[PDB]
Amino acid sequence: LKIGYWDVRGFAEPIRMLLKHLNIEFEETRYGFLPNRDEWLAEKFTLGLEFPNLPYLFDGDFKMTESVAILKRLARANGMIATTEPALSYSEMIEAMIIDIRNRLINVVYAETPEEFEQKLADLRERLETSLGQLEAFFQKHGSQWVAGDKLTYVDFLAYEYLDWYRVFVKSTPIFEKFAKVSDYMKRFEELPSLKEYIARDEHRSASCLSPFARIGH
Amino acid sequence: PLKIGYWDVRGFAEPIRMLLKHLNIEFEETRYGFLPNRDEWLAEKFTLGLEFPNLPYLFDGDFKMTESVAILKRLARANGMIATTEPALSYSEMIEAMIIDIRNRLINVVYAETPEEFEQKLADLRERLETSLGQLEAFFQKHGSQWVAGDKLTYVDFLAYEYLDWYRVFVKSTPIFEKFAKVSDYMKRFEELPSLKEYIARDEHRSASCLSPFARIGHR
Numbered sequence: 074l075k076i077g078y079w080d081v082r083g084f085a086e087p088i089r090m091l092l093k094h095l096n097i098e099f100e101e102t103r104y105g106f107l108p109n110r111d112e113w114l115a116e117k118f119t120l121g122l123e124f125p126n127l128p129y130l131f132d133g134d135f136k137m138t139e140s141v142a143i144l145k146r147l148a149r150a151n152g153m154i155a156t157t158e159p160a161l162s163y164s165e166m167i168e169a170m171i172i173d174i175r176n177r178l179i180n181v182v183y184a185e186t187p188e189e190f191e192q193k194l195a196d197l198r199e200r201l202e203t204s205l206g207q208l209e210a211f212f213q214k215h216g217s218q219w220v221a222g223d224k225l226t227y228v229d230f231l232a233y234e235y236l237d238w239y240r241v242f243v244k245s246t247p248i249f250e251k252f253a254k255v256s257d258y259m260k261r262f263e264e265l266p267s268l269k270e271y272i273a274r275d276e277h278r279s280a281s282c283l284s285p286f287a288r289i290g291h
Numbered sequence: 292p293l294k295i296g297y298w299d300v301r302g303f304a305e306p307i308r309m310l311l312k313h314l315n316i317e318f319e320e321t322r323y324g325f326l327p328n329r330d331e332w333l334a335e336k337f338t339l340g341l342e343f344p345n346l347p348y349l350f351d352g353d354f355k356m357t358e359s360v361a362i363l364k365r366l367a368r369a370n371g372m373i374a375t376t377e378p379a380l381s382y383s384e385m386i387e388a389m390i391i392d393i394r395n396r397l398i399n400v401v402y403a404e405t406p407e408e409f410e411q412k413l414a415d416l417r418e419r420l421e422t423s424l425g426q427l428e429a430f431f432q433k434h435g436s437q438w439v440a441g442d443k444l445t446y447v448d449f450l451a452y453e454y455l456d457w458y459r460v461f462v463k464s465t466p467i468f469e470k471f472a473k474v475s476d477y478m479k480r481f482e483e484l485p486s487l488k489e490y491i492a493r494d495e496h497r498s499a500s501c502l503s504p505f506a507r508i509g510h511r
Contacts, residue, residue: 123433124389124426135378142384146377158365159354165361170343180399207343214342 075131077102077120079113081281081291084140085128087230091144093271094225095151108285141172141231148227155221164221164228167211171228174204175235178243182287190288194243201239202248209252218261225265233262238282242290293318293366294350296339298332299325300500300510301457303359304347306449309496310363313449313486314370327504360391360450367446374440383440383447386430390447393423394454397462401506409507413462420458421467424474431473437480444484452481457501461509
């Protein structure tokens, strides 16, 4: 069981967290980087990936890419995903929403002045405020401990990680504190006795969220 | 008892429409119309009981959700149009995410914020398409399957066709599809499905704008 990705959190961290939570031992290739992409581009087309990319998964003799596709494959094989409706519908609805919140950040900090950049960052905070508002309302309405319900599933791993990025390097912590249930949700994930330790370790705490090719997050 | 709501174009709802037309399931539709504005949709937006108000939205009995993809899969699960076993599902969700990236690259361009910088962005998109489409060709070559998930048609093929078709329609990309013979065969195969053969030829689909007029291109 092997995972490949840059030596950062990035799109692979939710997967790293799922396995850590599940106590499943796995091996890693943390490609490093003035910085370049040569450590990865050396192995890129030699790994038998049908659509070479990062992160990539070696699962026995099976191989695949796409961060969310990988996370769910593992979740299914470990009972970490909703298998019934409407729970599963909620999961994939929030999945898509959490990935929209992530990509708005990605598309900004990976694009082609300094005061226009901060402008685009302040816009991400306003859209975030909105999103967390609707999300606060969702926890209030259903009263579920987690996204899909009372049990932890893959969607919560995507949620915590990509919403945390905003706290780390988008100065969004005060926006999280505005909403009571969302702030306790994040705190609950951190306090997960299964993950409480890994999250504290150098791998997650002191590591960069994004590659140095992003204008921020490193 | 089903109801779909979306702009009066193809957009992110067309795959949902096609899946339902393919399944021959009857459903109701609110097609929000539109110088053009969004007021029609904005008048109903926060009155429909959606937890995360957005287009497209779905009504299923008393159930209410958003997100175009999450909707397509919900309907496909209850009507046997999605792999339920590994590895077929891993392939589906891998190629799902990949197709949505191709879609989003286009989307992120056709929304604002010079015509030459823009013509360049489109030309960048076509080169990136050639790359991705070359990979899909290899996939269909390695796996001699008629569809993305194997021998049977599933939700992912509706995503693939609809969004890859957009490039052909208004991003001048038909020649790129012609370079890759398995992919070109794959596209046309979808158009010659007895269930969707007619519908894809009807004005509803063919003679309908792909995106809203708020995009710089992809509309009439």
